[PDB]
A paper describes a structure:
The β-glycosidase from the fall armyworm Spodoptera frugiperda (Sfβgly) is an extensively studied member of glycoside hydrolase family 1 (GH1) and is an attractive template from which to gain insight on how to rationally design more efficient enzymes. The Sfβgly catalytic mechanism relies on a pair of glutamates, the proton donor E187 and the nucleophile E399, which are responsible for glycosidic bond cleavage in a double substitution mechanism. In addition to residues involved in catalysis, the active site is also composed of two sets of residues involved in the substrate binding: the highly conserved residues in the glycone-binding site (GBS) interact to the substrate glycone through hydrogen bonds and stacking interactions, while residues lining the less-conserved aglycone-binding site (ABS) modulate the Sfβgly transglycosilase activity and its preference for alkyl or glucose moieties. Sfβgly presents the typical (β/α)8 barrel fold seen for GH1 enzymes.
To obtain diffraction-quality crystals, the full-length recombinant wild-type Sfβgly lacking the signal peptide (residues 21–509) was expressed as a secreted protein in P. pastoris and purified by ion-exchange chromatography. Sfβgly crystals belong to space group P1, with 6 molecules (chains A-F) in the asymmetric unit. Although chains A, B and C present the best quality parameters, the six chains are very similar, as seen by their structural alignment and RMSD values for aligned atoms (ranging from 0.084 to 0.192 Å). The recombinant expression of Sfβgly in P. pastoris yielded a protein glycosylated at N206. We were able to model two NAG moieties at this position in chains A, B and D and only one NAG at this position in chains C, E and F, for a total of nine NAG residues. Sfβgly chains A-B, C-D and E-F form dimers in which the monomers are related by non-crystallographic pseudo-twofold symmetry. The refined Sfβgly structure presents a Tris molecule, a known β-glycosidase competitive inhibitor bound at its active site. The oxygen atoms of the carboxylate groups in the side chains of catalytic glutamates E399 and E187 are 3.9 to 4.8 Å apart from each other (as expected for retaining β-glycosidases) and hydrogen bond the Tris molecule complexed at the active site. The highly conserved glycone-binding site (GBS) is composed of residues Q39, H142, N186, W444, E451 and W452 (red), which hydrogen bond hydroxyl groups from the substrate monosaccharide and are located at the bottom of the active site (red). The aglycone-binding site (ABS) is composed of residues E190, E194, K201, W371 and M453 (blue), which are located at the entrance (top opening) of the active site (blue).
Author numbering:
A (entry chain A), B (entry chain B): 22 to 509
């Protein structure tokens, strides 16, 4: 039997806007999601919002009770910048926001669950957005100041910080298009400008931690990037090339500056954007090139490579290029992309069960970026909220076991992989998709004001994998009621 | 009797959004006023907008005919950034946009009227505002690119450029509160952030002009700043000190970096902000102090001091302090201000006929900033739309004649004043006041599709002053019909 080492960290992950609720309580400022869903509710598919969500603001002791039921080693959550600094700036630190996170953290440590904190998981204060947000290079400073408040208030107890979660979803989807707040839809340059400012913010936050808190606190600071596998649709030179560009456009622009030896943006995509910008009449490249000291400043600034990974894609230089805006990043990249029709489908169009996809992605990164320290910070499966017998999720179980096998392949290739976090502990507000797509190991009842969390079959399977450290394909729980085991 | 020398440039001024109309014609992009008024029309007192305005886009030939009738030496108008560059960036230069400004200009020159062009008079493309506008340091570079296009296209014929009209109205009113688009109301630091970015954009446009255009074109590049006189309410050290600080807050903040010997922001106001910011718990000052390199970059970057001046105010250290937001610019300044109640009142609350105010403001500047070249780029009087017999404007006559006397006092004092531009050639969209407050020498019928222009009595008085170069207090126009005197 292949076995997970005892020290391998199993957890789950959530994000503040998706679970907390209490959106205008105890002095919390308005964020870009609050702003969007209140002004244009129609952008959410089921017309719902995160005003209450899973109400973790009030129900955090139950959340920890659920982590214990699972036997988790660690839990990854995010901090709401506007709950902590309602104006966005560090002149006003909200003590109710700080008390809550201290309460949640302290509850975790009481039962020996390791906290992993993400500083930014998509909920910028609306007041900062008014000033340009991630399009404004001053975001580096605002973020540095926020990171100080976070490290000094929580760093005594929390030893693993993530600056940003999924830059692509921040930059491309939020600034370069209309699929995430703040739906700026600045297709020509938004994504690239955001990219540059975000990785510079990261770097500043990193040097702060390294300079002013690491010596006393002894933790680590990193970043998480979404790295799905993108491979060539046909084993052809032109599709090998298309896939390479697609990777650079999907995650290379964010990872390269931080994790490459030389720094800056990926070279191939950079030349193609430059060519495109000139043909289009811009007196410079829509992709701002790094100066040599900017490259130096940003590279080397991560203690680990956090990887959010779900799936795989086939990429074609010619086929099935859905009409993209011009100019735009996906037009710059110039490729079509899709799932193999045989791969198991979830309730989310982009999400399929691609066999061994974690191992494929990490092997590529491990060779490309000089064998860094890896954590899988998100991986999971969506099911439709309308499903009959929604607590019985054999498809989710299938997906988790396949991810586990792929994690075990990574370990027997000597990839320095230290942990896995399932997305998500419980159902939550799934951005533009609202409550239609459910990722929880625990189901939440969003009609019920107590927001009762009930374990799905897969919660028991994950519990079983964590405890036994192997995947037993014959395991099915006899009872669907959770207990906490001894020592947890 | 005193006399204006023959070389004195008499003209009038207008701004693009206030007169042009054609707000979405011929590829023109959305600007911040289009956006504000179409999304929240109620912010305009009379529920008006500039969709059509005086329709100068179509009526420009009649506009020039009106300059001829007045016998103007010169005409100051603004260029619409979004009409020229619909996306805000220099990739697409809108040909119908350029053609319109080339037609307007070539018509002025055909009848020997000198064009003075303002690059920015408050109509930022909405696409650039989405990225933060003047809150975003990258505005410097966007503006420089826009300026290149302006100097390239029009500098062969236009030898006088003004970068920005009235930085206070842009920054304080627009970003620091809710009285101008884009009504961001970022009271704590919006004004100060904008201030820094605007004087930096100015300086870049200036060095661009100086290096790449001036040697061939032989023109000048300047800025216009609103400098109303602010004097002490009582002859007291406390009210002297209050008046100085108020001057620094209203205009010094914008003028000092560009026009003083040392550069940077004014010292007294800066220490005051740093003190307030410290006791408000900010980790730095809300006024970003210039580095030594920044101070040298921005200082010395104007060929003349364009002055918008209308009136004067009395200032107290203790009395009549309106309710100011905390933090804010007026709260940092911490003064009360009001017009002397004995002065003649116009249809605008802020605007009174303060006797000899031009001379008082300019004398102060002349001594403060070492004898620069001055133009009065705006000066004028407001009357109510509803006024009975709106073509008879003896109060306007009084204002203008007092202004002429004040200019002659300046010339007699040896102040290097080169010209005067009356606001405005015609009635136009008066921002938040719509068409309620009328400033025109010519009245416009805004319910008429042809937007007929008809001269007020004041048009005949101004025409007389330009012809004979003296103020005749006994002169009263014979006719209400206007003609072009030969030689014009
Ligand atoms: C976001 O911006 C894009 C690009 O400006 C818009 O997409 C286009 O709009 C027209 C009209 O709908 C389409 O026919 C074109 O295919 C697109 N234009 C270009 C230049 O590629 C899109 O509509 C905007 N989205 C939202 C939600 O406002
Ligand atoms: C712009 O911001 C100002 C300053 O915050 C707002 O003025 C006040 O509004 C709040 C309401 O929460 C009051 O409690 C304060 O007392 C007000 N300040 C003053 C000086 O009276 C104002 O509401 C905002 N303007 C908008 C949104 O148009």
């Amino acid at each position: 039997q292949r076995r997970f080492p005892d020290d391998f960290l199993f957890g789950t992950a959530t994000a503040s806007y998706q679970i907390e609720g209490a959106w205008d309580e105890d002095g919390k400022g308005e964020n870009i999601w609050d702003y969007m869903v209140h002004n244009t509710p129609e952008v959410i598919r089921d017309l719902s919002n995160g005003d209450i969500a899973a109400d973790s603001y009030h129900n955090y002791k139950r959340d920890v009770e659920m982590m214990r039921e699972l036997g988790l080693d660690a839990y990854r959550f995010s901090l709401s910048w506007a709950r902590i600094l309602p104006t966005g700036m560090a002149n006003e630190v909200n003590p109710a926001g700080i008390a809550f996170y201290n309460n949640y953290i302290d509850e975790m440590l009481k039962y020996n669950i390791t906290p992993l904190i993400t500083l930014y998981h998509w909920d910028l204060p609306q007041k900062l957005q008014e000033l340009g947000g991630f399009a404004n290079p001053l975001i580096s400073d605002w973020f540095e100041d926020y990171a100080r408040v976070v490290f000094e208030n929580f760093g005594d107890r929390v030893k693993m910080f993530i600056t940003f979660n999924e830059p692509r979803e921040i930059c491309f989807e939020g600034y370069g298009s209309a699929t995430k707040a703040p739906i700026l839809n600045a297709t020509a340059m938004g994504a690239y400008l955001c990219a540059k400012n975000l990785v510079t913010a990261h770097a500043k936050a990193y040097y702060l931690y390294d300079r002013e808190f690491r010596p006393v606190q002894g933790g680590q600071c990193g970043i998480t990037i979404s790295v799905n596998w993108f491979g060539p649709a046909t084993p052809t030179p032109e599709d090998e090339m298309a896939a390479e560009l697609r990777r650079q456009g999907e995650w290379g622009i964010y990872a390269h500056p931080i994790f490459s030896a030389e720094g800056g943006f990926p070279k191939e995509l950079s030349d193609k954007i430059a060519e495109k910008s000139a043909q289009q009449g811009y007196p410079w490249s829509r992709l701002p090139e790094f100066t040599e000291e900017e490259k130096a400043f940003v590279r080397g600034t991560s203690d680990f490579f956090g990887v959010n990974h779900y799936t795989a894609f086939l990429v074609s230089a010619t086929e099935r290029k859905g009409p993209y805006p011009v100019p735009s990043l996906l037009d710059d990249v110039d490729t079509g992309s899709w799932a193999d029709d045989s791969w198991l489908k979830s309730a989310s169009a982009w999400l399929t069960l691609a066999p061994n996809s974690i191992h494929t992605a990490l092997t590529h990164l491990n060779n490309l970026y000089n064998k860094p320290v890896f954590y899988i910070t998100e991986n999971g499966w969506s099911t439709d909220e309308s499903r009959e017998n929604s607590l019985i999720d054999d498809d989710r179980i299938q997906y988790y076991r396949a991810s586990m096998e792929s994690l075990l392949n990574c370990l027997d290739d000597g990839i320095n992989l230290k942990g896995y976090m399932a997305w998500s502990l419980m159902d939550n507000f799934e951005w533009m998709e609202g409550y239609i797509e459910r990722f929880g190991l625990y189901e939440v009842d969003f009609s019920d004001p107590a927001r009762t969390r009930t374990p799905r079959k897969a919660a028991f399977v994950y519990k079983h994998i964590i405890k036994h450290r192997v995947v037993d394909y014959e395991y099915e729980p006899e009872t669907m009621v959770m207990t906490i085991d001894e020592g947890h």
